[PDB]
Amino acid sequence: FAEDVGSNKGAIIGL
Amino acid sequence: FAEDVGSNKGAIIGL
Amino acid sequence: FAEDVGSNKGAIIGL
Amino acid sequence: FAEDVGSNKGAIIGL
Amino acid sequence: FAEDVGSNKGAIIGL
Incomplete structure (x- = not known):
């Protein structure tokens, strides 16, 4: 991502 | 993503 | 990422 | 990353 | 990274 x-x-968050 | x-x-969030 | x-x-966070 | x-x-955090 | x-x-943190 x-x-x-x-x-x-x-915020760019990949969980 | x-x-x-x-x-x-x-916010760009990929869970 | x-x-x-x-x-x-x-914040760019990859968990 | x-x-x-x-x-x-x-912050760029890879956990 | x-x-x-x-x-x-x-901060650029790779755990």
């Missing part, structure tokens, strides 16, 4: 993210200012 | 995200300012 | 991230100012 | 990160000012 | 990081001002 989140393989290609420009900007993360929040 | 979230393979290609420009900007994440919120 | 987070294979290609430009800027992370938030 | 975090294979290619430009700037990390937040 | 963190194979290629330009700047880390935060």
